[PDB]
Design a protein around this ligand. Structure first.
Ligand code: 62D
Ligand code: 62D
Ligand code: ZN
Ligand code: ZN
Lengths: 366, 366
């Protein structure tokens, strides 16, 4: 396989389905990336993550640079070897979680104290190299919401200068430039002119893929969709479109309808350890007393191993008892459900019936 | 298969190897039973428990009678169905954990408040029936250590009266008497005459197997072995001998040398979530800094899936980070190590070289 090749096999409106080919594997799009925090997809062996259908996972840089450390992971053979996942890994660039979980900002980057460290475009790209990332994200600033037009502009402009620094850092590292891909991140808050300026700046630098940054930061679904409506068409059509940090099943469906190809979210893993299970009839909270004697599986149609073997009653008991096996089973089912959703999306676009699928999905889920 | 058949295939000194055949499966002896607390072997799917080599697991009655409740588990189809383990389950009778984890004692049984309930020989045997246990333990009193000869005698006498009540309760329940086995429990503290009286009482009532109760209660290995030396030969030779709550690998080896056939302990699961890993060169604590860059597996010879795939360095990181996957991997390795120990014990007895194995095992483990 090539370092990076994105092919679009079918389209419906703004929605696309196709493949990203990389050295470590093929990614079917639209894609959902389970999140590995601290070098593990919580409560799952990598083989289980792959059995759910995942083609790629996301690695969080902030946690890994703190523990176990990026240089240590490189000394040990890289993140793939370390955690036992041999397919593609997308790594975030670290600043979103620095600003949410740990700080002093400047044009150079951000200094912060672990919940002292520094993060600059150059150091972010180097950490992602030391981890052995397949898809490297540019170092950006996720503008807070709401933002004034002046502050959104100033923030977006900084991120575009950092995008250029990220590009040059990545390109200066032969092994990284030859084997990995680099994605740029559009900013601009909710403002169409700033989103356009950001798209133009990123296309002029040139990236393998383009993320829509700065969303899912409290603006709500209607506003996120309004911004996606004008923002995604600004990005190069022939490269993947990644919506960072999204999201709930209905957010994914509407984002695909607006041209997004890639997603990640801690919702299925996080909320699964919490007791929320996704089903085609909407989410349920398995801790509710109504499930204490329910012998049905979490979802009536789900093909995952959890729904083949255990009841709602048993998983209700495990989560109420705080048992590790409850987090394992809930997480496997929820990531399998997300992957089945992505498969249904890909098949319906391929068959020119995605509009119908989206409508049917929502009528039943809600 | 029969309800219960114990066959001895080979002997060496007091050590025996053979099989227990039951309706739900064959148990190879000497056997180690992983412990299921609250209807789960912590951090393992049942398929993983079976992949380590386990033929039978232990179900704790005290926890299950409190949550989810024994009548609820019966309504749901029994413990096997509920947790997804279709092979034999041995259930404890509940009083050991009542006295350690929750009480008013009388000749009728014990009343206690959940960390209000009652437990009598008749109710214990009924709870084990409602769970669908394959091997039912008699309801006993684990005498505290140290005990005076008067108190040990009074306690042992009560337990033998409860043993008779347990036998009659079990026999009065046709479905239970036809499909399950019943084990009696010898008491008597460290006193040879009381151990003999207890063995005589239990053999006169008649059981499918005999446990050595009242040990591993703080007397220490030398004293436990001294009591096993005279106590195990008192029990019927042609039935299984079960040493409750034991134990560390060296305790198991010496107990087999003294005629024990069955074991259970939370050590491998419990201590695995804590960071202790068993190895043929003795235990290690994977949280120690020395393992942070160690690429070797937990044990150099272990055949388990964890040692095939992940390093000490990765498991060190997971346990230090409090990640669920660290408890999963440590638990699978430690239960696999215990099962490999039991396999080595069974093969060495079968080959008339267990004495040599015990000596070699200790020289290297210590
Ligand atoms: C860390 C890489 N950059 C980067 N990550 C993000 C992660 C997000 N996660 C959410 N909601 C869960 N919104 C995000 C926006 C960004 C964003 O604008 N930038
Ligand atoms: C609950 C069934 N009866 C019963 N369980 C026990 C469990 C033990 N566990 C240990 N050390 C970990 N000693 C024990 C003695 C008994 C015992 O004398 N009786
Ligand atoms: Zn499922
Ligand atoms: Zn192992």
């Amino acid at each position: 396989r090539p370092r990076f090749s994105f092919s679009i096999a079918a389209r419906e409106g703004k929605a696309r389905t196709g493949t990203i080919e990389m050295k470590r594997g093929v990614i079917r799009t639209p894609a959902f990336m389970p999140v590995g925090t601290a070098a593990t997809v919580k409560a799952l062996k990598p083989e289980t993550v792959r059995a759910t259908g995942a083609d790629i996972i996301l690695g969080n840089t902030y946690h890994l640079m703190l523990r176990p450390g990026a240089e240590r992971i490189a000394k040990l053979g890289g993140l793939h070897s370390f955690m036992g996942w041999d397919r593609p890994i997308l790594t975030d660039s670290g600043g979103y979680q620095v600003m949410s979980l740990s700080t002093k900002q400047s044009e150079e980057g951000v200094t912060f104290k672990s919940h002292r460290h520094m993060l600059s475009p150059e150091r972010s790209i180097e950490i992602q190299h030391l981890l052995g990332s397949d898809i490297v994200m540019a170092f950006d600033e996720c503008t807070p919401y709401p933002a004034t037009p002046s502050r959104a502009a100033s923030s977006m402009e900084r991120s575009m200068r950092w995008a250029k620094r990220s590009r040059d850092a990545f390109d200066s590292r032969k092994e990284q430039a030859e084997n990995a891909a680099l994605f740029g991140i559009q900013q601009g808050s909710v403002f169409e002119n700033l989103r356009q300026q950001s798209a133009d700046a990123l296309a002029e630098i040139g990236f393998d893929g383009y993320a829509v940054g700065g969303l899912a930061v409290g603006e709500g679904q209607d506003e996120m969709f309004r911004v996606l409506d004008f923002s995604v068409p600004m990005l190069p059509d022939d490269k993947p479109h990644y919506l960072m940090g999204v999201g709930k099943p209905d957010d994914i469906v509407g984002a695909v309808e607006r041209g997004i190809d890639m997603f990640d979210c801690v919702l299925p893993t996080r909320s699964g350890r919490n007791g929320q299970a996704f089903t085609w009839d909407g989410p349920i909270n398995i801790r509710n007393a109504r499930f204490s004697e329910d012998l049905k599986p979490l979802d009536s149609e789900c093909h995952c191993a959890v729904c083949q073997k255990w009841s709602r009653a048993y998983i209700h008991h495990l989560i109420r008892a705080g048992e590790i096996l409850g987090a394992m089973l809930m997480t496997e089912h929820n990531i399998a459900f997300y992957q089945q959703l992505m498969q249904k999306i890909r098949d319906s676009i391929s068959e020119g019936r995605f509009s119908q699928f989206a409508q049917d999905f929502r009528a039943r889920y809600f």
